């Protein structure tokens, strides 16, 4: 809930989940 | 001193002492704010204020 | 008194006086201004600077 | 040809021959400036300058 230094290096952005780009091919 | 190609990928700016950030701390004070029992001679309690400790 | 010459490059003026340049006593204080233990009484730490003393 | 999504990370941008940075060039000129003995006569010696290092 507290931000502090929220948007730090790559892991602190990795939990605010990223890039729903590829999915599987039938539907 | 001879410039050549000094603007470089990682090391040519690593001997130039990249970026002073995150100095170590005495914002969390000690011996001016803690290590302290020189409070006032004041008449009454309730200076306590229990906070939520999420961060 | 006996005037005569009163001029040799030394031992005339050296018999009169050489000019005072150094005076070896208290300009860096001791037991009058410094040698203190009569300091104040208040909130307590951090008047302690630290010099580089390169001179 | 085969379309897909070939805008990809480094190998998707590496088969189209990434940017030419260093040229490994003759600029310290060889056999047009050096490899000469074509200095002629002259009055005498020591136009020689000993430059300082870096």
């Amino acid at each position: 809930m507290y931000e502090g230094n929220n948007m730090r290096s790559m892991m602190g952005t990795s939990y605010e989940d990223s890039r729903l780009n590829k999915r599987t091919e039938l539907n | 001193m001879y410039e050549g190609n000094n603007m470089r990928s990682m090391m040519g700016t690593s001997y130039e002492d990249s970026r002073l950030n995150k100095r170590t701390e005495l914002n969390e004070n000690m011996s001016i704010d803690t290590n302290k029992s020189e409070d006032s001679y004041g008449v009454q309690i309730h200076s306590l204020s229990k906070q939520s400790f999420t961060g | 008194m006996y005037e005569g010459n009163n001029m040799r490059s030394m031992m005339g003026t050296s018999y009169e006086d050489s000019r005072l340049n150094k005076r070896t006593e208290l300009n860096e204080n001791m037991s009058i201004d410094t040698n203190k233990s009569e300091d104040s009484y208040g909130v307590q730490i951090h008047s302690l600077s630290k010099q580089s003393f390169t001179g | 040809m085969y379309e897909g999504n070939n805008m990809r990370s480094m190998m998707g941008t590496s088969y189209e021959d990434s940017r030419l940075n260093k040229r490994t060039e003759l600029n310290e000129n060889m056999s047009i400036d050096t490899n000469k003995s074509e200095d002629s006569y002259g009055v005498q010696i020591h136009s020689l300058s000993k430059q300082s290092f870096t």
Binding site: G4, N6, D17 | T24, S37, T54 | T34, N35, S37, K50 | -
Partner: protein, 392 residues
């Protein structure tokens, strides 16, 4: 203490789990489910006895943990290694002996001096690896996982700061015990005695005294004297917490003419100023539980067979291990009745924190990000200023 409860036997089966799926190269790939019964358990409610229990609240205490020494930090450049300082030793005047021969004018009396070569500091390092696979099996809110990833990072700087004050405290106490004169030490008898011997040790640092410094441990000063004063705006008194507490509740609280003689502005204090260890006799690592105890304090890089040099510093309670007994001694005063009254600007402390947050390394084979923190800290004590130890 044996239990035949069905929910307890369901929890007791360690073969079903997040652990065996993440240890082996192949694993089970579906789940049939488990009948969860809250009956006769700790997790029992009265209206519905068949759900898994719930969390509404997940906290993460954060404490910031300051330093109490970083006004002494001079931000240096970290280039070159060898620093050096010197003084010119004293030469007393002699008598005019007119019977000596006239060629005494031609002989040179060179000024003699005393130096002290310091050297380098210590590049110090710590890291932490955050997971994207199994840390998310906990933390039922994404905000809780981001709070965790920030709280670990904020803890790393806090135990940089408490480590630097443990090392400064240990440097001052280890210097007070080992490297000193016979003139510098005093012997108190009790607490009311030390509280006045501190008051008469100030007014001794600020006289023209050839003693009270340690230029005989300097490079050229083995024979000769060197006189130094202090100014009382530069004196640090390093005591325990019992001495400062005794001052503030008895001596300051039970005198009438307190208006001048209060020295507690200059007193740094510690609750228990021995907790840091050294090395003697140069052992090495051979036991498994020893490095298992070392892993709990963040030290990842030690393997079995790594050797420890003759002056290494351990900074946590470490003398209970099987290898280290007899080779590891604690930096502590032996009496809990202790005062080290030293001149400030005798403590050089030059740490270097510019290239400190180095860029991470995403490790996508295990889907994790390791962060490193590097800093160079040089701490040393000059032998050319006035110091007094008061102990037992």
């Amino acid at each position: 203490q044996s239990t035949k409860n069905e929910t307890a036997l369901l929890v007791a089966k360690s073969a079903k789990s997040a652990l065996q799926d993440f240890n082996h190269d192949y694993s089970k790939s579906w789940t049939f489910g488990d009948k969860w019964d809250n009956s006769n358990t700790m997790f029992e409610t009265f209206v519905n006895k068949y759900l898994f229990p719930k969390i509404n609240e997940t906290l993460l205490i954060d404490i910031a943990l300051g330093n109490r020494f970083n006004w002494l930090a001079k931000e240096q450049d970290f280039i070159g290694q060898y620093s050096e300082e010197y003084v010119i030793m004293d030469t007393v005047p002699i008598n005019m002996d007119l019977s000596k021969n006239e060629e005494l004018m031609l002989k040179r009396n060179y000024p003699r001096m005393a130096t002290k070569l310091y050297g380098n500091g210590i590049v110090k390092k710590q890291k932490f690896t955050l997971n994207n696979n199994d840390t998310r099996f906990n933390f039922q809110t994404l905000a809780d996982a981001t709070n965790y990833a920030l709280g670990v990072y904020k803890k790393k700087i806090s135990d940089i700061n408490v480590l630097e004050e443990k090392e400064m405290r240990a440097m001052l106490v280890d210097y007070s015990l080992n490297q000193l004169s016979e003139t510098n030490v005093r012997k108190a008898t009790s607490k009311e005695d030390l509280a006045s011997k501190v008051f008469e040790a100030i007014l001794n640092l600020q006289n023209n005294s050839a003693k009270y410094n340690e230029v005989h441990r300097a490079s050229g000063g083995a024979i000769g004297q060197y006189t130094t004063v202090s100014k009382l705006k530069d004196i640090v008194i390093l005591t325990t917490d019992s001495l400062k507490s005794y001052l503030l509740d008895t001596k300051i609280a039970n005198t009438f003419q307190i208006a001048g003689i209060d020295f507690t502005d200059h007193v740094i204090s510690f609750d228990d100023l021995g907790g840091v260890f050294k090395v003697t006799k140069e052992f090495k690592l051979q036991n498994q539980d020893s490095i298992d105890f070392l892993r709990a304090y963040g030290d990842y890089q030690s393997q079995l067979g790594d050797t420890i040099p003759v002056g290494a510093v351990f900074t946590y309670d470490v003398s209970k291990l099987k290898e280290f007994t007899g080779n590891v001694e604690e930096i502590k005063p032996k009496s809990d009745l202790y005062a080290f009254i030293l001149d400030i600007n005798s403590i050089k402390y030059k740490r270097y924190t510019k290239g400190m947050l180095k860029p991470p390394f995403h490790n996508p084979e295990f889907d994790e990000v390791t962060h490193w923190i590097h800093y160079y800290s040089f701490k040393a004590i000059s032998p050319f200023f006035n110091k007094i130890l008061i102990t037992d």
